Structures are given as C-alpha cells and as structure tokens.
From a paper:
The ATP-binding cassette (ABC) transporter ABCB1, also known as Multidrug resistance protein (MDR)1 or P-glycoprotein (p-gp) is a ubiquitously expressed drug exporter that plays a key role in cellular drug handling. ABCB1 is a type II ABC exporter/type IV ABC transporter with each transmembrane domain (TMD) comprising 6 transmembrane helices (TMs) and followed by a cytosolic nucleotide-binding domain (NBD). It is topologically arranged as a pseudo-symmetric domain-swapped dimer with the 4th and 5th TMs of each TMD making extensive contacts with the opposing TMDs and NBDs as first revealed by the structure of its bacterial homolog Sav1866. Here we present cryo-EM structures of lipid-embedded human ABCB1 in conformationally distinct apo-, substrate-bound, inhibitor-bound, and nucleotide-trapped states at 3.4–3.9 Å resolution, in the absence of stabilizing antibodies or mutations.
The predominant conformation of apo-ABCB1 observed here features an asymmetric TMD arrangement with a closed central TMD pathway, closely spaced NBDs, and widely spaced extracellular “wings”. We chose to classify this state as an IFCLOSED state based on TMD conformation. The structure is marked by multiple secondary structure (SS) breaks in the TMDs mediated by Glycine and Proline residues and several predicted SS breakers, most noticeably at G317 and G329 that leads to an elongation of extracellular loop (ECL)3 and wide separation between TM5 and TM6. Closing of the central TMD pathway is facilitated by TM4, which adopts a kinked conformation with secondary structure breaks at P223 and K242, effectively dividing it into three sub-helices (TM4a-c). In conjunction with TM6 and TM12, it forms a central 3TM bundle that closes off the central cavity. In contrast to TM4, TM10 adopts a straight conformation, contributing further to structural asymmetry and leading to a lateral opening to the lower bilayer leaflet. These features lead to an overall conformation that diverges widely from canonical IF open conformations as demonstrated by a comparison to the alphafold-predicted structure of ABCB1. The IFCLOSED state that is dominant from our analysis is incompatible with substrate binding, with TM4 involved in 3TM bundle formation to close the TMD pathway and also sterically occluding the substrate-binding site. As such, TM4 may play an autoinhibitory role and act as an affinity filter akin to the regulatory domains of ABCC-type transporters. First, the IFCLOSED apo state lays the foundation for the development of a new class of ABCB1 inhibitors that could potentially trap it, thereby preventing substrate access to the TMD.
Author numbering: 33 to 81, 106 to 606, 694 to 1230
Write the structure that this text describes.
Amino acid sequence: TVSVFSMFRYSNWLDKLYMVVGTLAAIIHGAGLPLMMLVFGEMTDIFANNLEEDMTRYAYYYSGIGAGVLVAAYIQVSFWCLAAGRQIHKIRKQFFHAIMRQEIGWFDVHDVGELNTRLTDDVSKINEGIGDKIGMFFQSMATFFTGFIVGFTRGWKLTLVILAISPVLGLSAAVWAKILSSFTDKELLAYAKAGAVAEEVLAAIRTVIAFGGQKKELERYNKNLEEAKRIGIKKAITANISIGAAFLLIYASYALAFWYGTTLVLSGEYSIGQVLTVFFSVLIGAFSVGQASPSIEAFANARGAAYEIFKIIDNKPSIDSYSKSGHKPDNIKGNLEFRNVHFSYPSRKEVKILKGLNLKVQSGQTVALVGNSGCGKSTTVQLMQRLYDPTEGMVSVDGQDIRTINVRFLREIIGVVSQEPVLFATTIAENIRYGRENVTMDEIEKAVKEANAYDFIMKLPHKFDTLVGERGAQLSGGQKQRIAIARALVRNPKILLLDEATSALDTESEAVVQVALDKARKGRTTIVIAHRLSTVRNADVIAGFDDGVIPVSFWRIMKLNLTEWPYFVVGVFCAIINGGLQPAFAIIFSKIIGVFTRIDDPETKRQNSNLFSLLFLALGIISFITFFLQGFTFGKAGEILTKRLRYMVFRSMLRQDVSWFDDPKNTTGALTTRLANDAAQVKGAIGSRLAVITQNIANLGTGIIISFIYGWQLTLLLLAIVPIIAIAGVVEMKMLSGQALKDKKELEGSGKIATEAIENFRTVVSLTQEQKFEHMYAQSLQVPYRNSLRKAHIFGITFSFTQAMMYFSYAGCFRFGAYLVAHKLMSFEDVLLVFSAVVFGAMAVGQVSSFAPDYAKAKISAAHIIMIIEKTPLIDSYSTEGLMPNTLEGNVTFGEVVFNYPTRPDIPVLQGLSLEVKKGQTLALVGSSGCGKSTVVQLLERFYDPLAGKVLLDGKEIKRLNVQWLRAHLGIVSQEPILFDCSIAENIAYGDNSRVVSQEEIVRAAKEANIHAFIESLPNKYSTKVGDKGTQLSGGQKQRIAIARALVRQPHILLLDEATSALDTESEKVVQEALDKAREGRTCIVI
C-alpha cells in the first residue's frame, strides 16, 4: 500500500548488513539441493560402469555441499530473525510515542478499541511479514532457477518432456491461482457498498427500531448483496477460465510441436544417470514455487498494516507537547481572560457551543459560572488548557496569549479536578505522586493532611500500601474525589478549575468534600463550574452558563449450504478425477520414456506420431475441463452460501432487542466485522474442506496403490520414511507455536500499560504524565526484547536440524534405491514411477494443505454465526401475537416504575415516580428530580422493560399490547435527526412504512413543516441525495425534515427529545412555530 522499500524505514547499518548476509546465505542454501542431484548423477554414472578413488572424490564433494548448506541454513534464519526483532522493537516503541503525541481533537474521531487492537495485532503482523518469510522466499527462488538451469544444461529436450507429463503443471496452476487470489480481491468494493449500507443502518439502530423499517433496510441489503454475488461469480469464472485456457494453450502447443516433425524434435540420446539429474532437479525446482506463496501473502499483509502504522506515526499534530520551542514566562500571577471567543467542535463544525463568550478574571479572584448537566458545562475548562484552539478571538494569560507559550509548561500550573476522579491500578502513594514526580513523602503527607482524607486512609488498613482502586475495593465517590484533590494539591497549581465536583456524589458526604474544596480553594484563581446553586455563594462572581450565554465449536454446518447439492456432487466428482489424474501422469511417463530417448531406431517407424499428439490434446482437454468445473462450481457454491448466511445473520441482528446492542461487548464495529469478515472468508473454508480432503485422498491413495502394484520393498520403505519428514514438519510447527503462543503471555504488561494509557488519555494529557507511561512501556518492551533476541538461536537450531533431516532423507533413498535397481528386481522407470507417486504426492498434499484456509477459525466463526441467530427473541419487534385495539385515547400513566440499565444494574435510574397524562396536555421532565429525562422515551416505546412498576396506556398495561402496533402510533423527534443516504422523498416517506405513500402526502407534510420552499429551491426537486456525498443541510433544514417525517405517520402521541437545542439561535423561530402548529390536538411530552 505504501511501497516496497519503505517498510524497512528503521534500519541502521547493522540491520542492513544482517539482511544482506541473510539473503546471501539463503541464496546459497536454495541452490544446494539441485546441485546435490548433479553430483548424485555423476556418482551413479561412475558406478554403473580405481573404484575407491572415484567414490571417495565425490563423497567429499557430497559431504562438502552438505556441510555448507547446514551452515547456510542457520545463517539464513538466524540473521533474518534478528533483523526483524530489532526493527519491530523500534517500530513498536516509536508507534506508541506517536499515539501519546496526538492531541484530544484526534482521539475522539478514532476509537480506543480500534487503536488498542491495531497496536496489539498489526505490529505482530508486520513482524510476521518482514520476519523469516522473506528469506524463505529467496531460498525457493534460489532453488527454482537453479533447478531449471540444471535441467537445461544437461539436455533441453528431456526437461520439456518432464515439464509436461509430470505433476508439475497442476501444482503450478494451483499456486498461480493462490497468488492471483492473494492479489486481485475485487470483492472489497462491492461489499464496501453493502457494508456502508449495513453500518449506516446499524449506527442508526435506534430510529430504525423506533420506526419499524427493518424490512426496507433488509431489502436494500439483499439487493446490494445480490449485486456483490453476481460480480464475485463473474470474477471466479474469469479467473478459472483464464488459467484453464493457459493450460490448454500449453498442451495444444505441445501437440502442434509434435506435429510437423515426427518426434525427432523432442528425442535424443541420454545416459542412465543423466535422466535422474534432469528429472529430480527439475521436479524439485518446480515444486519449490509452492513455498513462495505464503511469503508473498505475508509481505502483502505487512505492507497493508504498515500503511496505517506509518500514517499514524508520520502525522504532525497542530499542537504538541513534545516541542520545547516556546515562551516560558515566570511570575504568572494569573490573568486568564476570554476576549469574546467563539468556539465550535472540530468534528461537528455546524453545531456551535460557545457563541462569543467574554470573561475577565484578575489575580486572587474566583468565579462561580453555573452550567446545565445536558451540555455546555466543561467546554471552557477544555478550552482553557489548550485542548482545543479557539476559532475566533484569543485567550491570554497575564496579558500574553497562550498560543506563544509552550503547552507543556502551560498545563503544569492548572488544576483539573473533574467529574469522575479516574484512578490508576497502582498504590495510593503512586496515585498521589503521579503529578510532580520529584515528590518526597513529606509533601504527600502535607497534601493528605490538607485534603481531609488521611483519617479515612488510616482508619482502613494498608497505610498507602496497595489500596488499588480499579480491580480491588472500589471506593466511594467522596474518597475518590478527596484523592483527586490531594493529587491536584501535590501538583501545586495557580489556576484551579474544579469542575463538576458536586455532579453525582450523594448529599450525605457533601460536608467533608465541600470543606476540603473551600480549604484548598484559597490563594488561587478559581473558575468552579457547578449545577446546584447552594454552595458556590462564597465565590466573588456568580453567573449562569447555558449554550454560550453568560462458546464451543459445532458441527452440523453442512446443514447450511445444503440446497446447493448438485454443485457439491459435480465438484466432488471433478476433485476425485483431478486428484487421480496426477499419479496417472507417472504411469504415462514410465510408458513413454522409452520413446523419447532413442535415435538409433529409424525415424520411419516414428512410433505413431499422431496418437501422441492425440494423447497430449486429450490430457489438456481433461485437465482444462476438470480444473474449470471444480473451481467454478465450488466458487459459486461458496458465494451463494455466504450471501444467504449474510442475509440471515443481518435479519437476526435486526430482530433482537436494543439492549443487546447496548451491551459493550458488541458495538457497531464488532457487528460490521462479523458481517464482513466472519461470514465470507470462513464458511467457504468449511465448504471447500470436502474438496481439499477429496483431492488429497485421490492424490495419495491412488499413488500408494499404483506403487504397490509396481513395487513392494521400495514402496514400503518410502511409506516408512515419509512419516519421518511429516513428524519433522510437525516438530517445526510445534516449535513455532511454542513461541507464537508464549508471545501473548510475554507481551501482557506492555499491552495492559498501553491500554491503560490510551483509555484514560484525557487524564494523562491533562496531568502531562505521558513521559512516565512511555518509560514504563519502554521497560515492558525491553524485557520481551531480550526474550525475542534469545528466541533466534532456538529457531535457527530447529530449522537447521529439520533442514538437515530433510537433506539426509534424500541421500538414504538413493542409497537404498540403487541397492534395488543394481540387483535387477526393479527397473529404473519403475523407480521413477514409485518416487513420483509417493514422495511427490506427499509433498503435493503437504502444499495443498497450506492453501484452503485452516479449519480452526472457520469453526469458531460458524459457532458465532449460529449463536447470533435466534439469540435474544425475548422482545421481538414483529411478534405475531398481541391485541391491536382501534381506539387510542393517548393517556399514559406510570406507577412505581423502577428500571435499571442492564449494563450497570447496580446504579438505579428510576425512583418509582407517578406520572399521569391526559389527552391534549403537554408536560416536561426538566423540572423533575433530574437525571430521568432521557429514559421515558425508551420506556414508552418499549425499548426496555421495567423490572418493577407499571405503565398503563389508556388504562391498559402496555406489556400485553403488540409491540409493532405500539411503535406504529408514536411520533419521535430527537435533538438531531439522522438521514439515510437516499433521496429526500424516501427520507420523508420513511415515517410510515405500512404502505407506500405517493408524492402528494410528502408534499403536504413538507408544506406543514415549512420546508417545501427550501426543497423546491434546490436544483433537484426530490432526487437529491443527502448525507456525506449529498447536499449538506443546516440544523434547521434537518429539523424540518425530521418534523415532516414524523408528521407523515400522523401519530397520536409526540415525544420531543431536546429539539430546541439552541442551534445558533437563528432558525429557531421557524422550527418552533412549525412544531407548535403540528402539536395542536395531540398529546406531547417534551424532554
């Protein structure tokens, strides 16, 4: 994604030398096995015909090659794994440095879970990418050319004979298909559109559920998925037909070459040993290409992850603390001011929070600005600390603007006591000493004495010993606030900004906290923000602030993808014949070898000439047909399965309750990933496991049977030796997984420190304690750094020993085989046949098992998919039962209603009020006890379920009525509307999905919403799109569109959720009068 020479950005001279020596050793190692074939052939030629002198000369040659490759095998892996270990340590340490530098305005746009997951996984992905794989790649190439070179030095004809008949071509086509699959994609765009629709619906799940438009969204998703299925089928057809056409062209060219010259073109005189060289070397070189595909896949994934890693690293923030270039004034008596400053959030530019606020505080003063819990409370607190730069105007301290002061020095003289006193999982002494790192115990003691908290600490055991406040005994709000006050006192600031110190903690402990605040407030400027106006009277200046105004894996997966049984039958038959064809190639070669290696026989006989071309054409046609049929059928079956599964899982997700979405385990990102990743790349693996198993069985069993027919002793010897190399590969993968799984345990302290810093990032930047967290992460990396550098020796030794065993296996086979052919028994053609069957079927199945994605994540993904279906039908949106009365009096009564949020049931939200509504009467909950305004909209719409209490609609309990009918007779308007990416006409007709409404109803609703003129003034009357790529609209236009959408339904009860959110105080009159005009003769409840 970025480049090919940019992933190696962090590499000094030593790492460059490591990589160069590693790749040179790999090149030497790769060109060793084909060269051994050459000397083996020389030795056999000499033997077939002083004997000890020739035998011992090549024996030292044979031992000399073996010794060098044994050393080269160690150097190839040892030096590459050291270079990757040194770069990843620098990348991992540098990436976390960049994260701690980005300001607050960037974190809210991104996701903390996404950032932690990326830091945990894509760095490991890069490590796997630039690790030992690259070296392996060169080895394969170092073999490949070498083998062919040998095959083309000792007679080019024979290679051309072996290149066609032998099993080379099918495996080559399989690996070309693997690479093309790894490089094309082209599904991504289609499912990108479909998943854009999916995430648009999922993010707006509240309004979709409240409006009952599940079927319409399901149909839109179905249409997009059908388009994706069509394009995927076309792509699979094109790819498979192209590869098959290449196969057919190769074999037809062979057949034509055999014409126009009756076999004299491809025949010559060859020795008994030369054929062994030009056969085994060519076969090994052609088979080596199968080992270079995982390397290419790994490198591509490494580039993909490194793109995002380097984008985050390279970005330069507008304001950064890691820049010691700024004014550092002394004697800051404190003269903060606001020179009529307008501020708007960078994310929501249209919404304005600070509408030109002016403030002026002298030294040794205090302010008591009073805010509202809904919003407009902590914006000035954030703006003062240079978290967000002002849009218009400026903020100055002591007559000096803060834009010319280094932010690191600026943030170290400001108190930041906030609503929730977040603490870290460490000792209380460390928590108090986080600010002002050069602090002795005496200062901490003095602060806790002037914090009204040491008495409580001493009454409890463990005097500042551990008292962890994250996983241990969770302290009460009062003592946590006292701890935060102590930390602020240790910081020793000059501008104290106590914010929401009386937000949610109980009134029982108000005395101690308030006394501590009053004691600590003396001697410094104070901009206290409070909601209750009964204890901030001690401040010099009091003003009001408001809107700028002052499981287990399961089988039975085959039940899914069952209706498409003819595709499976045809694919299985084609897999059987394709797998069985490859061993038959050995028989064909053993039968026709005698015709391509003799010129003494007159060309008049020419054998037959024509039937050889017929055989080549027949083999080409059969291979083409079988490969095309297998690929097309299995691809089509997999795509149909994934489309149907996506449809069903999306329907199941839509059906279930909103509380399932409210669970923090599954957010919109998790569900999008489930619909995207774990429904298409996994179930295809289970569907094609039948194909791969059938192909492997047909490849191996047929070869074993034909070898047994053509031999007994050598066949049994090879059937005994192949399990040895299989066990060697098992040991290799076991050693790889021994550290691939121990790495997670090793990298656990670093991960927890990183996630603690990232999750609480606002407190970290406020305290300017990023350097300490960076150092802790540095140590938690340093220990696993030594562990990873020690892993290199073990990995190198294991790889070297496995390679030595694989190298010694070939020598033993030739020693025994020559022991059989010399004493008659088996002809050399039979030896070639049995080798090509047994060992080159074992290698072939070993390579094919690497493809066809693993049956490990597919099972857990299938379990997740199955568990998502029929998961929580407790409150089904389209329940069939229930009564639907015709009359609707519109009376809502509440009695002793007690409800708790399922995510946090310990904290109550409903006190058990008694609220009764008559027809044609309006009321608001702002004047109630508070904190219970944004909940009644869930209760009346049956989003949740009251644990204790009762709700009556027109004197009837709402639990018995059908949910769909209840949702179809309620109008809801929120503070802001979310508009789907479609035309305005559909966004207006969305109000009533029971039946299709024509243009007349939409026009009348727009007229009643005072929005018709604006819509008609647009270049497109009703076909204009909205959202991201559409025509952007202001707050008033969106509010009017929402009012029109609500009024299309013609409901009987209206639910307003802070509609008058003070959107610039310019278009409020028109929307207010439209709402008042639409509120006549209808029950309403304003929040």
